[PDB]
Design a protein around this motif. Structure first.
Motif, PDB file in Angstrom:
ATOM      1  N   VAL A 283       0.846  -1.187   0.000  1.00 40.46           N
ATOM      2  CA  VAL A 283       0.000   0.000   0.000  1.00 40.46           C
ATOM      3  C   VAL A 283       0.883   1.238   0.000  1.00 40.46           C
ATOM      4  O   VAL A 283       1.817   1.349   0.800  1.00 40.46           O
ATOM      5  CB  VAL A 283      -0.947  -0.009   1.209  1.00 40.46           C
ATOM      6  N   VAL A 284       0.595   2.170  -0.904  1.00 36.46           N
ATOM      7  CA  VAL A 284       1.334   3.420  -1.010  1.00 36.46           C
ATOM      8  C   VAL A 284       0.336   4.571  -0.994  1.00 36.46           C
ATOM      9  O   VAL A 284      -0.664   4.543  -1.717  1.00 36.46           O
ATOM     10  CB  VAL A 284       2.221   3.453  -2.273  1.00 36.46           C
ATOM     11  N   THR A 285       0.589   5.562  -0.146  1.00 36.73           N
ATOM     12  CA  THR A 285      -0.277   6.724  -0.055  1.00 36.73           C
ATOM     13  C   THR A 285      -0.063   7.643  -1.254  1.00 36.73           C
ATOM     14  O   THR A 285       0.944   7.563  -1.956  1.00 36.73           O
ATOM     15  CB  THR A 285      -0.022   7.487   1.242  1.00 36.73           C
ATOM     16  N   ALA A 286      -1.040   8.523  -1.487  1.00 32.70           N
ATOM     17  CA  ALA A 286      -0.975   9.412  -2.642  1.00 32.70           C
ATOM     18  C   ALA A 286       0.172  10.411  -2.523  1.00 32.70           C
ATOM     19  O   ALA A 286       0.892  10.661  -3.498  1.00 32.70           O
ATOM     20  CB  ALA A 286      -2.303  10.142  -2.810  1.00 32.70           C
ATOM     21  N   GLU A 287       0.354  11.000  -1.342  1.00 30.61           N
ATOM     22  CA  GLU A 287       1.443  11.950  -1.152  1.00 30.61           C
ATOM     23  C   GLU A 287       2.797  11.274  -1.320  1.00 30.61           C
ATOM     24  O   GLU A 287       3.711  11.840  -1.932  1.00 30.61           O
ATOM     25  CB  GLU A 287       1.326  12.599   0.226  1.00 30.61           C
ATOM     26  N   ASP A 288       2.941  10.061  -0.784  1.00 28.22           N
ATOM     27  CA  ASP A 288       4.185   9.318  -0.945  1.00 28.22           C
ATOM     28  C   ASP A 288       4.434   8.962  -2.401  1.00 28.22           C
ATOM     29  O   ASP A 288       5.569   9.033  -2.876  1.00 28.22           O
ATOM     30  CB  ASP A 288       4.161   8.058  -0.087  1.00 28.22           C
ATOM     31  N   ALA A 289       3.388   8.569  -3.125  1.00 31.12           N
ATOM     32  CA  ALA A 289       3.542   8.271  -4.544  1.00 31.12           C
ATOM     33  C   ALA A 289       4.017   9.497  -5.311  1.00 31.12           C
ATOM     34  O   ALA A 289       4.965   9.426  -6.103  1.00 31.12           O
ATOM     35  CB  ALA A 289       2.220   7.758  -5.112  1.00 31.12           C
ATOM     36  N   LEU A 290       3.381  10.644  -5.067  1.00 33.23           N
ATOM     37  CA  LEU A 290       3.768  11.858  -5.776  1.00 33.23           C
ATOM     38  C   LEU A 290       5.197  12.265  -5.448  1.00 33.23           C
ATOM     39  O   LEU A 290       5.962  12.634  -6.346  1.00 33.23           O
ATOM     40  CB  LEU A 290       2.804  12.992  -5.447  1.00 33.23           C
TER      41      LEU A 290
END
Ligand SMILES: CCCCCCCCCCCCCCCCCC(=O)OC[C@H](COP(=O)([O-])OCC[N+](C)(C)C)OC(=O)CCCCCCCCCCCCCCCCC
Lengths: 54, 71
Positions: free
Chosen positions: A29-36
């Motif tokens: 699982v990867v959060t949106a902020e971490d992905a960006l």
């Protein structure tokens, strides 16, 4: 014309399979902020929920 | 008198191409499945009950034959 049936057969073996779901659900699982910030693009962002497509 | 010939779609285009998911239901109900399971369980229990009572009677007969021979 004949390819949607192949996708359907592929989904019959994996989509609702409980073993496939146990292997794939809540894994990586990867959060949106971490992905960006990490610079992910494509299905990584879209799985995190980011509405972006070039 | 030659015209340009090229790879083009037919007049009116091609037919529709299915792309949506088509997973059907194709199943009974949970109630009916459980009912079938319970029914087969009960039939098996009844058959085993009768057969095992018969086996007990047969064992009693064999033991009686042994008792008759024992002296
Ligand atoms: C103890 C037995 C437990 C069986 C499963 C319990 C659940 C029943 C169930 O899901 O019922 C749905 C269905 C009953 O049908 P249904 O009516 O529920 O729905 C099916 C779909 N329609 C509506 C179209 C009919 O049961 C089956 O499909 C039974 C077949 C399962 C077989 C599993 C392996 C056991 C047999 C091994 C030998 C096979 C022959 C050898 C060759 C093999 C191939 C190369």
């Amino acid at each position: 014309k004949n390819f949607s049936f192949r996708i359907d057969e592929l989904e019959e073996m994996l989509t609702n399979n409980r073993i496939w779901r146990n292997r794939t659900v809540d894994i990586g699982v990867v959060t949106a902020e971490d992905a960006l910030n990490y610079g992910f693009s494509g299905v990584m962002l879209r799985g995190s929920g980011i509405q972006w497509d070039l | 008198a030659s015209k340009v010939k090229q790879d083009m779609p037919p007049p009116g285009g091609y037919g529709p191409i299915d792309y949506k998911r088509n997973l059907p239901r194709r199943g009974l109900s949970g109630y009916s499945m459980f009912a079938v399971g319970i029914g087969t369980l009960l039939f098996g229990y009844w058959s085993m009950m009768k057969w095992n009572r018969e086996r007990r009677r047969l064992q009693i007969e064999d033991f009686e034959a042994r008792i008759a021979l024992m002296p």
